[PDB]
Amino acid sequence: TRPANHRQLTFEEIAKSAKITVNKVELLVMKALSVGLVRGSIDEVDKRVHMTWVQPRVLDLQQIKGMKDRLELWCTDVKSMELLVEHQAQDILT
Amino acid sequence: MVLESTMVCVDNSEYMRNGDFLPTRLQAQQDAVNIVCHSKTRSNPENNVGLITLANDCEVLTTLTPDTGRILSKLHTVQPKGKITFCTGIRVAHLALKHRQGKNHKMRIIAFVGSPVEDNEKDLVKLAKRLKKEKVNVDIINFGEEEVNTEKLTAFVNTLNGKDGTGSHLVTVPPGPSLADALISSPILAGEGGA
Amino acid sequence: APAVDTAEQVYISSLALLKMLKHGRAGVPMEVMGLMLGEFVDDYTVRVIDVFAMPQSGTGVSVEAVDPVFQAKMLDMLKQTGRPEMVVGWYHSHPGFGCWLSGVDINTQQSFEALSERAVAVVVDPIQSVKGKVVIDAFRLINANMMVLGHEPRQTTSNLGHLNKPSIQALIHGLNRHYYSITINYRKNELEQKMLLNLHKKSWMEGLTLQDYSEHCKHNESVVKEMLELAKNYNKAVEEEDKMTPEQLAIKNVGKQDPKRHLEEHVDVLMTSNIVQCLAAMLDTVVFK
Amino acid sequence: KQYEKSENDLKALQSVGQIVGEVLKQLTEEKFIVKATNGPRYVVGCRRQL
Amino acid sequence: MPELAVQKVVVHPLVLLSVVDHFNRIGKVGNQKRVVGVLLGSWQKKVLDVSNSFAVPFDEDDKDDSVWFLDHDYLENMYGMFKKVNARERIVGWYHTGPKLHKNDIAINELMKRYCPNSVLVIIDVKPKDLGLPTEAYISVEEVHDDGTPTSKTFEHVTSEIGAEEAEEVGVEHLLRDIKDTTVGTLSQRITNQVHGLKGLNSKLLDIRTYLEKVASGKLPINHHIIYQLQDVFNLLPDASLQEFVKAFYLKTNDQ
Amino acid sequence: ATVIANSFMHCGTTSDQFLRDNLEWLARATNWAKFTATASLGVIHKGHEKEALQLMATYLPKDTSPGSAYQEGGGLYALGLIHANHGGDIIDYLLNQLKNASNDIVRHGGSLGLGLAAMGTARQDVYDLLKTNLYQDDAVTGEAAGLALGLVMLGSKNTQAIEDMVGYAQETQHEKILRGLAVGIALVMYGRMEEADALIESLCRDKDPILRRSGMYTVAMAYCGSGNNKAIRRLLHVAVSDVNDDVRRAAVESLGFILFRTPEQCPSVVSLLSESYNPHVRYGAAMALGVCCAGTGNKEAINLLEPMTNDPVNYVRQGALIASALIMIQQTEITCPKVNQFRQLYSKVINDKHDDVMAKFGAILAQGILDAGGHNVTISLQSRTGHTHMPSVVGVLVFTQFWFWFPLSHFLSLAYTPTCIIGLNKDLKMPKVQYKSNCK
Amino acid sequence: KIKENSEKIKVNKTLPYLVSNVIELLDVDPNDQEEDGANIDLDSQRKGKCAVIKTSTRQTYFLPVIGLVDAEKL
Amino acid sequence: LNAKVRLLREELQLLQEQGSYVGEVVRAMDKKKVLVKVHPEGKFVVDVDKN
Amino acid sequence: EFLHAQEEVKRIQSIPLVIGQFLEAVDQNTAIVGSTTGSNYYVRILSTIDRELLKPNASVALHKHSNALV
Amino acid sequence: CTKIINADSEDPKYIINVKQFAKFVVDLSDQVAPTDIEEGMRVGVDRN
């Protein structure tokens, strides 16, 4: 749901969604990592599971739409930025 | 026939399953085509023969060449259960007539009907009119329509005659047992030469 | 009353030149040949659209190898493709000497001259070409008949004029017995230049692609170590440089060529990689996020 | 069959025939100084296809 | 019939030059229609080297793309002949000349395999589809796609590279003095390349966006490869920081 | 090269001598070299109006004397060259022949001769005829006609000529015809400055190389007589970037033309080009210097010319040799040592056979232009009306072209005006009266 | 295709050409461990079987033998 | 920079010219040629150079 | 153009090459060497690369196509 | 010719050895016969 700013979620936040205890959630997440369904790291000092990698999600319409949000945003940041790269020493490209 | 190039259209259908022509209508139609193709070359070596299909997505399988063997090889192999899209077969045959190794020949298509035609009568009437202008003549051999009921072909033929390199005509063979090959008797080997 | 029958300056397109360079290069040390197909328009321009090789020779560019049969066979096919073109001339490679025809080759050349007067003979040297316009000349056959007519000056007229160079023995001998030399100039369109350039997708992408941070630090430290060496020579050079010419001063008060230059090149390469990667890194992080 | 057997000469001539050696000294993996069987010594390359 | 030996392909500049030239010339066919000719290169090897191309008789009609002209025999004749000019030029397959990849192309792909050893379908366009090469390489694939849709026959793309042999390199290098992607000669040369990668990236973003909508409305087949590829960019997480470099130069400039 | 040189050298006098000795020369001759010789007679016998029709008479088409195509066409050119710079009667004669035959190599001469006689009428009749000659797509009559047309419409900026010649240039990919239309287009564009800019951009813009190569001529005439900054910038910019050899060479020749009025600015600009080892750029550089300095000779221009002369590549030598002669134009041995040395230098190229064929061509032409008028004619930098002299520019622009067809250099005769005290009174008579002269 | 091959070998077969003697054969495998150009073949850019000859200059060549008459036939 | 470009380009053509050996002029002959004794190869009589 | 030109020389610096021994320098331009091919050569030393650490005694390579000391 | 044995699919070839220490084969530009080329017989042959 979250953009490419954070793929980090806390244990607390995972527990709320799951509606399963914080303790058992920590073991469950570890078994999923172990199998290889998901990848990432667990920092239990912070208590976040930082997802490096996430798998192909469920095919519903909404899920097609989630992809659009990032692609559209990316179109505008690239335009802005492309102009800054052209700007620097425009006198010499030759 | 003299200074002429002809492409033969083979009708792959689902009404070629009948043994009214032996062995199978289609196999009898291969044979009918092959003797006509040979007759044309033998009579006048100035003849070229090419092969096009209605079957599948429509493409020119082999082109016009003095060699009857080039066309024959492909004819047997083309899918017996093909499409009876007539109009698309005619159009591609027009494109091949343009591209030959020596260009001085008239443009002709001789067409086989293994079956009653699927696509509207309206469409064929039109195609015939535009095609007539480019000066490609389609001569239609009729056994195929007749199996269920009287020939639609005669109307398309009539529209076609008026401007052609050589005349168009309906050659009729009974759809039952008299064999496909009987077409050698009716003239398609040499048209009417008409205007 | 007189006719034309001059050798016009041959316009070689970008694809045809590449096909000649490739034909020769595989083809040598063996003497090889093939035909040139094009269109000739006007009385100044012959454009060489395409070439292909009509079966390659053995020992010599033999008179056996020139074949009207193969030439005829290939020509009728072209008609069916809807590209009918005519034989504009023919090309051959010699590795023997740059811009030279063999003895056998002049006889072979005569069959092409009879077919069309505008038949040309191109000598390709793959051994001695490392610019690929170099050591290629267009030539024309000198028979007993041609020399008596005075066809040889007649060729220079209608273009910029061109004489060969490679080797002394090959230029004197070639000029008398073998040929007269005439010009090749090149026209290649802007589309041809665009395809020539090889636009490539990863080629531009690398510019953005971020290199390791540790690798820049490591490099920064390595680069400094080259400057240190140069720095001893550089301290001595700088003490007196009170006259003119920095290079003389620098050599004189120890330090081969320019110690300053060496130092500067060393920072520039490191600065270049670090500077672009920093520009790229800040940009990507913000864009993707 | 007849085609492939004659054609083998056709390709070999374009590959160009081979002058043979034995490897004299391994200095680096890009250049090797190689010694001809005939005699005169040469520098050869190694390609990454072997 | 089908087989894979395509893998990755490298293209000499000669292929690119040959297809446009023959394409217009072939009978003044419009430069947005489907035209196919034989594609030459070395073959029955794992890495594919596309050397050259040559035309095969083709006419493309307006009324449908299910009506076209092609001479199959011509493919066979050409194969033998190309061997004399170079040993590296044999029947590799066929070339398509844009603009997209059509259903109508699939009928010819089938056919080509018999004629050629197994063929490749390379699409060489007259204008890039991105900003780099105008070539795409394809192999026919059958894959199950689910959203209410059955198993689809499609063409799955494999990435392309550039590359040439020594003869080709010699002429292009002497002739070139153009601006290029980058030549390299200054720091400033390098920025031109940086501008070109970023502009390229903009182009790809537009194609995917318009398609995402089409998938949602139509229930177009969902290819696993696309959904997975886009997903990955998002998950990796950007992080970037500390950067520095030297400043030795001043004493040197001052020194001059 | 000898025919051009002599055409210029023996000008301003009648010469029955020339026809009588150089009959064997005419017989010996082949190709374009033969055409130049029959054509050249007009320049040698320039003026001498009574005799004009009579001397040429055999060469000129007859029912009682039909020669070679080469002779018939050169005959027609010869009347046009004598009466050059307009003459009402001369046109009518050329016009009947042009429209009737509509042939090849004979027609080519007719168009050139006809162009001169018509020069500065803007006639529609002439437009119709020359159009017919172009339209066939016959190679020789096409280049001649395209150029011929531009002479007639010149300096009024007639719209129609520009339209006809441009539309044709684009459809047709014939390079020979192409060069002749472009030049035609330039002759019309003269002295309109900034206006010309719309057409000039269109010609550089195209993916075609041929338009671009001939494109430089338009810029050259129009911006001459007050040169624009944008216009010089383009000429330099196209040259560096190109891989197309002819296009490159050409760009460099025009630089001298726009600066013709301020000759001072050109040797610096050319210096950068002189230094490179590119022979195509070297060729153009020589020409640039040659035209700018042509009225007002600079020492600096001469020095740049020296390495191009002895260079390996064939064409650069030619350029240098023709160019020096043109700057220094008809100064005596008492004005400078340089003219005397240069006359000998050309001879030298001829004595030795170590040198290119092409250097030899330039050497004999060079001697002749310098020596032109019989040591009486000069080319102007500008008129002293503070804009450029029209005969000087039209002639020089065309002169560059001699390879496509060699009789096109004869057109040079238009630049040549002698410098004297001029002081006619009312009745079409110069007087015999003496003039005060306060010079050595 | 056959007539074209057949004429080219013949141009090769006509003199000049060296004569030597075959001391030994080896006949090593086709396609050693490489891929380059053309196709896998007895000889090409890929060559298997060869025969070593000692020529009359006291020079040695190991060369691939044409398949018209093989190295195994040699 | 022009000069540097030129040096390499000239260097490339000048050099391509095959061969270049050493000999010794043992003697000179009345044919205004000199006998060269090439040290591990055949002896060759050549014309004088202009150098 | 300088970057394009350097490319061209690199190719020559590389194989084909034939080895010799480099005896001594008679000019910075050109030097005398001896081959294993049975020919003593006067070969040119490639410019815009050092010819001044060329000069001591060492093994050296000469190009086969150009007959120079690259 | 050191020895006569060759006549391999052309009018008699034999091994003739030039004094550059290389062996070559002969063809007709006059004739060739068992008697024209012999065990000791020297021959005149072309360079190319």
Residue E178: its chain F contacts at CB < 8 A? 241, 243
Q: How far is CA B15 from CA B147, B152, C114, in A?
A: 9, 16, 61
Q: Which chain G residues have any C-beta within 8 angstroms of a chain D C-beta?
A: 1-2, 5-6, 8-9, 12, 32-38, 41-45, 47, 59-64, 66-68
Q: Which of residues 1-50 of D touch G (CB under 8 A)?
A: 2-15, 17-20, 37-39, 49-50
Tokens of F160: 């129609």
Expressed in Å, this structure's resolution amounts to: 12.8
Q: How far is CA H19 from CA F76, H37, I40, I64, J47, in A?
A: 58, 16, 11, 9, 21
Say yes or no for a CB contact (<8 Å) between C279 and A74.
no
Binding partners of F (≥3 Cβ pairs within 8 A) = C, E, H
Tell me how close the Cα of A90 comes to any Cα of chain E, in angstroms: 9
Any idea what DSSP says for residue C178? Answer: I
Tell me how close the Cα of C44 comes to any Cα of chain F, in angstroms: 7
Residues 6+ apart with CB under 8 A from F202: none
The total of other beta-carbon atoms located within 10 Å of residue B102's CB is: 12
* Whether the Cβ atoms of residue I6 and residue I27 lie closer than 8 Å to each other: no
Give the up-direction half-sphere exposure of residue A63: CA atoms within 13 A in the CB hemisphere.
11
Q: How many CB pairs under 8 A join C and G?
A: 26
Residue C130: its chain I contacts at CB < 8 A? 8, 11-12
> What is the spatial distance between Cα A18 and Cα B113, in angstroms, rounded to a whole number?
69
Give the up-direction half-sphere exposure of residue A75: CA atoms within 13 A in the CB hemisphere.
13
Say yes or no for a CB contact (<8 Å) between J25 and G15.
yes
> What is the spatial distance between Cα F16 and Cα F344, in angstroms, rounded to a whole number?
29
Task: State residue B85 phi and psi, 5-degree precision.
Answer: -70, 90
Tell me how close the Cα of C258 comes to any Cα of chain H, in angstroms: 17
Cα nearest neighbour of B53 on chain E: E67
The total of other beta-carbon atoms located within 10 Å of residue C156's CB is: 23
| Cβ neighbourhood burial of C217 (10 Å; 0-12, 13-18, 19+) | middle
Tell me how close the Cα of G28 comes to any Cα of chain D, in angstroms: 15
Task: List, in sequence order, every residue forming a beta bridge with H47; answer none if it has no partner.
Answer: H33
Domain boundaries, chain C: 9-197, 208-282
Q: What letter represents residue B10's amino acid?
A: V
* Whether the Cβ atoms of residue B3 and residue B132 lie closer than 8 Å to each other: no
F307 — alpha (psi -120 to 50), left (phi > 0) or beta?
alpha
Please, what's the b/e burial string for H9-41 (b: 16 or more CB within 10 A of its CB; e: otherwise)? bebbbebbbeeebbbeeeeeeeeeebebeeeee
Q: What letter represents residue I31's amino acid?
A: A
Experimental method: cryo-EM
Binding partners of J (≥3 Cβ pairs within 8 A) = G
Orientation angle between helical segments E73-85 and D2-15, nearest 10 degrees: 40
Residue F243: its chain E contacts at CB < 8 A? 175-178
Please, what's the b/e burial string for I24-49 (b: 16 or more CB within 10 A of its CB; e: otherwise)? ebeeeeebebbbbbebbbbbbbbbee
Check CB contact of C127 with chain I, cutoff 8 Å.
yes
Tell me how close the Cα of E59 comes to any Cα of chain B, in angstroms: 6
Say yes or no for a CB contact (<8 Å) between A65 and E206.
no
Pairing of strands C10-12, C184-186: parallel
Any idea what DSSP says for residue B20? Answer: S
Closest CA to I1 of H9, C197, C186: H9
How big is chain B by its Cα radius of gyration, in Å? 15
Tokens of F77: 């050119």
Q: How far is CA E73 from CA B48, F110, F290, F298, G44, in A?
A: 16, 55, 62, 71, 26
**Interface test mutation site (partner C, options B101, B103, B104, B105, max chain C beta carbons within 10 A):** B101
Q: Which of residues 11-30 of F touch C (CB under 8 A)?
A: 30
Say yes or no for a CB contact (<8 Å) between C131 and I11.
no
> What is the spatial distance between Cα E13 and Cα C194, in angstroms, rounded to a whole number?
10
* Whether the Cβ atoms of residue C97 and residue C169 lie closer than 8 Å to each other: yes
Alpha helices (runs of H) in B62-162, residue ranges in sequence order? 68-77, 86-98, 121-134, 153-160
Say yes or no for a CB contact (<8 Å) between C135 and H16.
yes
Alpha helices (runs of H) in C182-258, residue ranges in sequence order? 190-197, 201-205, 213-238, 246-252
State the first-to-last Cα distance of chain F, in angstroms, to the nearest integer: 36
**Interface test mutation site (partner F, options E28, E31, E177, max chain F beta carbons within 10 A):** E177
> What is the spatial distance between Cα B113 and Cα E180, in angstroms, rounded to a whole number?
59
> What is the spatial distance between Cα C219 and Cα C226, in angstroms, rounded to a whole number?
11
Tell me how close the Cα of I32 comes to any Cα of chain E, in angstroms: 30
> What is the spatial distance between Cα H46 and Cα H24, in angstroms, rounded to a whole number?
12
Say yes or no for a CB contact (<8 Å) between B59 and E108.
yes
Please, what's the b/e burial string for J17-48 (b: 16 or more CB within 10 A of its CB; e: otherwise)? eeeeeebbbbeeeeebeeeebeeeeeeeeeee
> What is the spatial distance between Cα I17 and Cα E136, in angstroms, rounded to a whole number?
39
Closest CA to A48 of A74, A29, A73, A67: A29
Residue B98: its chain C contacts at CB < 8 A? 82
> What is the spatial distance between Cα E73 and Cα E58, in angstroms, rounded to a whole number?
13
> What is the spatial distance between Cα C111 and Cα C104, in angstroms, rounded to a whole number?
12
Cβ contact F–H (≥3 pairs, < 8 Å): yes
Task: List, in sequence order, every residue forming a beta bridge with C180; answer none if it has no partner.
Answer: C140
User: What is the DSSP code string of D1-50?
Assistant: -HHHHHHHHHHHHHH-----EEEEE-S-SSEEEEEESSS--EEEE--TT-
Residues 6+ apart with CB under 8 A from C232: none
Task: State residue E96 phi and psi, 5-degree precision.
Answer: -115, 150
> What is the spatial distance between Cα C231 and Cα C225, in angstroms, rounded to a whole number?
10
Say yes or no for a CB contact (<8 Å) between G59 and D9.
no
> What is the spatial distance between Cα E83 and Cα F187, in angstroms, rounded to a whole number?
55
Tell me how close the Cα of C258 comes to any Cα of chain I, in angstroms: 14
- Strand (E) or helix (H) holding I21: strand I17-25
> What is the spatial distance between Cα C35 and Cα C71, in angstroms, rounded to a whole number?
9
Closest Cβ–Cβ partner in C2, C41, C43 for F30: C2
**Interface test mutation site (partner G, options D3, D10, D35, D48, max chain G beta carbons within 10 A):** D10
> What is the spatial distance between Cα C87 and Cα F129, in angstroms, rounded to a whole number?
36
Check CB contact of A5 with chain C, cutoff 8 Å.
yes
Check CB contact of I11 with chain C, cutoff 8 Å.
yes
Give the up-direction half-sphere exposure of residue C204: CA atoms within 13 A in the CB hemisphere.
20
Task: State residue F376 phi and psi, 5-degree precision.
Answer: -145, -10
Tell me how close the Cα of H45 comes to any Cα of chain I, in angstroms: 18
Task: List, in sequence order, every residue forming a beta bridge with C89; answer none if it has no partner.
Answer: C36
> What is the spatial distance between Cα F171 and Cα F201, in angstroms, rounded to a whole number?
18
**Long-range contacts made by residues J35-39, C-beta under 8 angstroms, separation at least 24?**
J36/J12, J37/J1, J37/J4, J37/J12, J38/J1, J38/J4, J39/J1, J39/J2, J39/J3, J39/J4
Residue C65: its chain D contacts at CB < 8 A? none
Tell me how close the Cα of I48 comes to any Cα of chain C, in angstroms: 13
> What is the spatial distance between Cα I65 and Cα I15, in angstroms, rounded to a whole number?
10
Angle at B26 between CA B70 and CA B4, to 5 degrees: 40
**Interface test mutation site (partner D, options G26, G47, G49, G54, max chain D beta carbons within 10 A):** G47
Binding partners of C (≥3 Cβ pairs within 8 A) = A, B, D, E, F, G, H, I
- Strand (E) or helix (H) holding E51: strand E48-55
* Whether the Cβ atoms of residue E135 and residue E120 lie closer than 8 Å to each other: no
Tell me how close the Cα of I10 comes to any Cα of chain E, in angstroms: 12
Task: List, in sequence order, every residue forming a beta bridge with E161; answer none if it has no partner.
Answer: E10
Say yes or no for a CB contact (<8 Å) between I36 and D33.
no
